[PDB]
Design a protein around this ligand. Structure first.
Ligand SMILES: O=c1ccn([C@@H]2O[C@H](COP(=O)(O)OP(=O)(O)O)[C@@H](O)[C@H]2O)c(=O)[nH]1
Ligand SMILES: O=c1ccn([C@@H]2O[C@H](COP(=O)(O)OP(=O)(O)O)[C@@H](O)[C@H]2O)c(=O)[nH]1
Ligand SMILES: O=c1ccn([C@@H]2O[C@H](COP(=O)(O)OP(=O)(O)O)[C@@H](O)[C@H]2O)c(=O)[nH]1
Ligand SMILES: OC[C@H]1O[C@](O)(CO)[C@@H](O)[C@@H]1O
Ligand SMILES: OC[C@H]1O[C@](O)(CO)[C@@H](O)[C@@H]1O
Ligand SMILES: OC[C@H]1O[C@](O)(CO)[C@@H](O)[C@@H]1O
Ligand SMILES: [K+]
Ligand SMILES: [K+]
Ligand SMILES: [K+]
Lengths: 781, 793, 163
């Protein structure tokens, strides 16, 4: 259809100089044209697959995404046809002219990480995305198979392995594969004739003699299994055996977790700016992790005591919180502590809380201080370092590098996906958000880390129809700053999806009566239904018996709570059916956060404009999870629902919590909740970009539920089941420790290739991050 | 760690050998290398030294002893290219193993008071080297092509995937739309194996002298385009060499074949700084041996390219461009004209491009140390002009010196062309401790830019040409020029852990020469230019003092002690003038004639100016009038040639008193004329001259011994005039053997082929080092370059 | 093929080192002694020998530097004088560094090896007289007698040149 394409490409040029997204890159062009389409044909689907089109007057550039992880970039002359393939860097020039009127300096930096990753071949199959440890096992398995040069690393790894001066695994008496091989079967003979329950103390004598140190297991049954595992690996390595063995070797004893930004505490915090599911996730996590860390250490017949430190910022003037104390024990843990260290400058300690977008100038000193502090606290150096978010990943990287430790990173969110076009428009946003700093560190720690943990597949490769969070970092550009040609790869074996959960002490079904905490009911009923208007709650509910549309979240632009309210306000029918209760912001105090402040004013005006009094109850931040668990359950009592109208949501812990509680959930389809929920089954999806539609849908849920009461239960049980499968903390802790073994080892084998990457990254941090970071204005007390 | 053991010997020689460790720590807080680390306590000690045993190694290999905390940071060099550094305590028993990047850390604590930052940049190129293995063997230093050949010869041997590149290479190969070697017809090795088979039988039958035009018809049929040879005999050999690589590659063949493939057609040569001209320039600031080298080089090169093109059966016409700056205001020169034809060449042209800013072009001359902010825009522009002049793209880019290597890299990268660099000198060796003391020197010499650019270029380039072995690995006793860039630090800026490895296969030694029509033995009377003897006699023995010459020579009949050079601190002319002035015996035996500096005009170069003040002052101090003649720059080489020979008539000598000299063309010229030469032992001339045979060495740091060594020489020559003739013939022979232009081009062209082919196979391995370098330039050089103040017109 | 397989390969080079170390005739050690257990010591020793020899007068007999060479692990057969021993040590150093076919051959061909030789000619009347022309007696017999004579001259030489 030579006379046809020219048309859509015409309609495209009609909008002139611009780029538009895949919704429009089609939804205007294709449909808005006459029946002249007559295209269900093969050309079409370049459009259907286009993630974005960049239009400059003669030219249209295309980014095509046939399958997750697979990208093609093209150019098309809007007249004359002539389709021509372009390299990513050249598709990026297109964006750059679109903003600066010219491309980036001929000699300005292109970041290309691809040539540094080549050590392992990359999986091309959808199934290995997020599954990288699986892939890397098969690789190490094969590599190890009857290759002495390849098997040596395993022997040395085990021979050097020790903790805090106690030798483990093999002694120095085992210098080679023959002696190892011979000794291992010697031991195996012996153990075969012992009673399974024999303790390691009995035969400990023999082992020491033949070079076998502690850590093979607690009893003779377990030392035997592990030994046999090693025999097999030396003999005929297969992936499963390799993984079991590596996950079994005692390694993680001390763990250090980085979470500098926000108010990190166990109470009186949640909902404050920059304080949210990351504090929630980390706390649940260290708990689960300590449990497993203990069983493993016990099972391997070791008596060591673990330590887990959560490194965060010391906020001296945070009041009503514990953020001012240097060490704080984590609730229900013998070994987990929060360790606080202050930001400081030449002038000395910095007192006032600082926004996450502003911490950059302070992070490098933080690292050095953090290092000195955990040296006092830890017995031996860290066996694992987990960075969280950006400031977290950045510092985690520097410490890992400094201390020589296995590093993992968890994003918890990626702003580039939260703030559309913040890469291309970065300059007008920088004074406020400093994205040039963040993106830089995002890219740095993303690559520098030994492996990566995500909570969804969406986080990596997104969906079939849409781009993932890390995926969107593969190729992008910051005009006038630098260009990322290939910055990350969704197939990188380093990615692992390990899904978190909600603490199941706090969140359970609303139908377990013995379990419900009734003593909170007086407080909740006041919270929800009372006639008083104060800084704790605004407006009032006229009709107490209606079902509740409940939401709770940090208060800011992206969470789009002001949107949800307007949807509700506009929609009379929903208003008749259910009362909107929003929890966000702490109005008890003066708001020090820009977005929070902005969103508050928006709230107030929405109240007046839509006359929200009597249908709308605006509650301040509920900072106690225990009463929060019961608050969720209370909403269920009313046959209400949880809605999450975020423009973008990286994961959505509250979405998991609500479901865990039995509460039917309606969540944004942008980001993680798109994976978490199965439309019509475990909950529903709504589009934050179409709000009125969202509301109508909710109206509809309630109407159906009114006529048929069991519809509410289908969904309730649908989510209950779903959460039972994909999201729980049980396997998380064990998966994580296993990865630390596999990746811990793999980094010895691959070490020589990561050298080139080491230096690349060093020079990127030094010559790019530091200078950007210093440019960020310091706080003033 | 062999050198930490023989030093452990304080258990034997102790109460004596911990003295030298005293007289050192007794100077304090500094670096003293070699002559000071040596001519210190050992010579200045007492016979209770008696260290002539096993200890005499670790001091004889140091290269530096840096006074320090109650600590001594020292270094040791067992063999060129192998590194041991020590740090010991005086009285504290602090002796510590020293592993690199740690030893540098100690050099930083000796300036900043603490080491560099924490996460402050470390530069390590070592990991980006891993493609080929390194020669560990001394012979391969500066020989790298010989090593790369054997690596390729092997990698090529019976490997399918491995030979493909060679086919693809010869398949794509074309010039300005003409296809050469293999056409597109041949898609695989089997077809090529066969097509080559067929070709051979046919040609074996034809008579040796059959022109390619005859069988051109047949060839085009089977896939064989032009470039194999002009006649059948040649095409035959060539075809046989290729068959051979396909079967049993050996290094000698691989090189020869790659050598002959017609490749280099358009050469582009970078020389931005200075006044680059063929007349009225030499002796000016920044204008010197590099200009002479390049002009001699291109002429030589053009000839070889012509006969290589002819032999290979091609009529393509070569072009060689010399890029340099357009100085619109240098008057009395051609430096203001865009295009200039080089003397005695058909195809070599000088191409001048102006520096500029957004405010328009920059007219004033600028010191070579200050050009940095200008170079990147220069590159863009130069690209544009040479695109205009050149037919097709550059087949080779040669960078020269520091600014020149910076640019030639950017072009090479931009245009995707094989690149060679020639340093012509490296300032870090010439300006001692300029690395560690860089911060105080910066506003004058801007060393942060220069070093950065030097490191960038060394690693960016495809191959490197040096004029001597010493320029790379130095000697047994002393460290080499490039070598000294392996590990160093600029405290506060960055720290170079592994910057270069003297064993790198990219180092190739190709020794330049002196133009034979200009410089030849003073004895060939038929050739002597007597037309000049009036000018020259006025120059030397004239009665007048002016801007052309200062003081006067009372005695017209003495042998002349002669030197000529650009005037700057390092050339150390002020040094020689003093040595001569203090030594009465030398003054009686010879007249001193120093040519340097141009006093006809006011001088705009800082060092030139400073040097004149010293000259002026010495003349008065040592009352030099009547024994001394200070002559201004001689910009015409033809007469320069006759001047050298004239000096021979007086039976004088040539002296080169540099604190450091990278090569010393004047040394070569002097000997080529037959003038017995005394030259600085620091740098290149150590290698050129063979002491007591082809000439003599002197140490600029002991000048009074130098002046006397010379007095000795003139004395012997007065007793035995045959002694002069002996050194003269020795020099003449040394030149005829090692330094000449004839083989240069062949070597250079051959190299371009081998390294050209190579860079296709190694394409992927280098991809990382390529991004590392891209960033280094963008994030390191640029900020530094924009830092440098712009010249103001 | 050997030149290419030998280029920077450990498991490859050992065979050549094992060869020279095992090499002996009539109860005398030749080339390398048992003092050299690995390429590092060999590499180090050769280099060590080279520095020494490059110093001496070319025509210096092996017996002079013999004592020292025995110290560092070098047995007889490298050559009869400094010059010869030098080229030879330089040859092997090269096989360890950058093996080429011409070097490899030259070295292997130089190492003193062939001393005793056994030639088989069972059939015919094999003799130096009164035979040629008998059944089965002819060109083979002639060839062999010329061969040995020519062979013996070359061996006495190679033996003497290798000291
Ligand atoms: O006023 C509030 C708002 C948030 N939360 C808790 O904070 C977490 C929010 O996590 P989510 O991942 O859903 O949002 P994030 O803040 O991480 O973007 C959930 O555990 C909520 O129960 C809270 O306790 N009080
Ligand atoms: O007044 C002068 C001074 C310099 N030269 C020439 O400049 C070159 C200097 O080269 P050399 O390597 O010796 O010193 P450089 O200047 O390169 O450092 C030689 O060819 C000299 O003949 C000259 O012709 N007249
Ligand atoms: O009566 C005879 C017959 C043969 N020959 C020698 O035997 C050899 C014959 O060898 P040739 O290779 O020619 O034939 P062959 O015997 O090997 O088959 C030659 O040297 C002859 O001179 C000889 O001397 N007298
Ligand atoms: O932008 C996402 C934000 O949400 C959090 O999870 C809240 O703690 C943090 O990771 C980040 O501040
Ligand atoms: O540094 C020495 C200087 O002298 C030159 O030879 C001048 O032609 C150049 O190499 C350099 O500018
Ligand atoms: O086949 C030829 C015959 O003649 C010989 O040369 C013997 O003189 C042998 O080779 C064989 O017996
Ligand atoms: K161990
Ligand atoms: K071709
Ligand atoms: K032997």
């Amino acid at each position: 259809n030579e006379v046809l394409a020219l048309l859509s490409r015409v309609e495209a040029k009609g909008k002139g100089i611009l780029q538009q997204n895949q919704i429009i890159a089609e939804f205007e062009a294709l449909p808005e044209q006459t029946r002249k389409k007559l295209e269900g044909g093969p050309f079409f689907d370049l459009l259907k697959s286009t993630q974005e089109a960049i239009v400059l007057p003669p030219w249209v550039a295309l980014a095509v995404r046939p399958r997750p992880g697979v990208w093609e970039y093209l150019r098309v002359n809007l007249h004359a046809l002539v389709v021509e393939e372009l390299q990513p860097a050249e598709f990026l020039h297109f964006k750059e002219e679109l903003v600066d009127g010219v491309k980036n300096g001929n000699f300005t930096l292109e970041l290309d990480f691809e040539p540094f990753n080549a050590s392992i071949p990359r999986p091309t199959l959808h199934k290995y995305i997020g599954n990288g440890v699986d892939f890397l096992n098969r690789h190490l398995s094969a590599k190890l198979f009857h290759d002495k040069e390849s098997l040596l690393p395993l022997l040395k790894f085990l021979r050097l392995h020790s903790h805090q001066g106690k030798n483990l695994m093999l002694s120095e008496k085992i210098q080679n594969l023959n002696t190892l091989q011979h000794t291992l079967r010697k031991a195996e003979e012996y153990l075969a004739e012992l009673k399974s329950e024999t303790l390691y103390e009995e035969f400990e004598a023999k082992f020491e003699e033949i070079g076998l140190e502690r850590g093979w297991g607690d009893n003779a049954e377990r030392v035997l299994d592990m030994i046999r595992l090693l025999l097999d690996l030396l003999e005929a390595p297969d992936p499963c055996t390799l993984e079991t063995f590596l996950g079994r070797v005692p390694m993680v004893f001390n763990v250090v977790i980085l979470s500098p930004h926000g108010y990190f505490a166990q109470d009186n915090v949640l909902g404050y700016p920059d304080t949210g599911g990351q504090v929630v996730y980390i706390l649940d996590q260290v708990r689960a992790l300590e449990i497993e860390m203990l069983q493993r250490i016990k099972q391997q017949g070791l008596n060591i005591k673990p330590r887990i430190l959560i490194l965060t910022r010391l906020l001296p003037d945070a009041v009503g919180t514990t953020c001012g104390e240097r060490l704080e024990r984590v609730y229900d843990s013998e070994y987990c502590d929060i360790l606080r260290v202050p930001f400081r400058t030449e002038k000395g300690i910095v007192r006032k809380w600082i926004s996450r977008f502003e911490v950059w100038p302070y992070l490098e000193t933080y690292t050095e201080d953090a290092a000195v502090e955990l040296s006092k606290e830890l017995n031996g150096k860290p066996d694992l370092i987990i960075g969280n978010y950006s400031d977290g990943n950045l510092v985690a990287s520097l410490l890992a590098h400094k201390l020589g430790v296995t590093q993992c990173t968890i994003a918890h969110a990626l702003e580039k996906t939260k703030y559309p076009d913040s890469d291309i428009y970065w300059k007008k946003l920088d004074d406020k958000y400093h994205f040039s700093c963040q993106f830089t560190a995002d890219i740095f720690a993303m690559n520098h880390t030994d492996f990566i943990i995500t909570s969804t597949f969406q986080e990596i490769a997104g969906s079939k129809e849409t781009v993932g969070q890390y995926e969107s970092h593969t190729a992008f550009t910051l005009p006038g700053l630098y260009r990322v040609v290939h910055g990350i790869d969704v197939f990188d074996p380093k990615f692992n999806i390990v899904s978190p959960g909600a603490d199941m002490s706090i969140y359970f079904p609303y139908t377990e009566e013995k379990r419900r905490l009734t003593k909170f009911h007086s407080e909740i009923e006041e919270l929800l239904y009372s006639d008083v208007e104060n800084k704790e709650h605004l407006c009032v509910l006229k009709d107490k018996k209606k079902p509740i549309l409940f939401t709770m979240a940090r208060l800011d632009r992206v969470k789009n709570l002001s949107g949800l309210v307007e949807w509700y306000g506009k929609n009379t029918r929903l208003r008749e059916l259910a009362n909107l209760v929003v929890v966000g912001g702490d109005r008890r105090k003066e708001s020090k956060d820009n977005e929070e402040k902005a969103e508050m004013k928006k709230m107030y005006d929405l109240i007046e404009e839509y006359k929200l009094n009597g249908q709308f109850r605006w509650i301040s931040s509920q900072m106690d999870r225990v009463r929060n668990g019961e608050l969720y359950r209370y909403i269920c009592d009313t046959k209400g629902a949880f809605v999450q109208p975020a423009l973008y949501e990286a994961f959505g812990l509250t979405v998991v919590e609500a479901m865990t509680c039995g509460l039917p959930t309606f969540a944004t389809c942008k980001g993680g909740p798109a994976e978490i929920i199965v439309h019509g089954k475990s909950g529903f999806h709504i589009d934050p970009y179409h709000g009125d539609q969202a509301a109508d849908t909710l109206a509809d849920f309630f109407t159906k539920c009114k006529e048929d009461p069991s519809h509410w239960d289908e969904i309730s049980k649908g989510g209950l089941q779903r959460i039972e499968e994909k999201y729980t903390w049980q396997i998380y802790s064990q998966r994580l420790l296993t990865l630390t073994g596999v990746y811990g080892f793999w980094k010895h084998v691959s070490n020589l290739d990561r050298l080139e990457a080491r230096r690349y990254l060093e020079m990127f941090y030094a010559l790019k991050y530091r200078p950007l970071a210093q440019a960020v204005p310091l706080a003033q007390d």
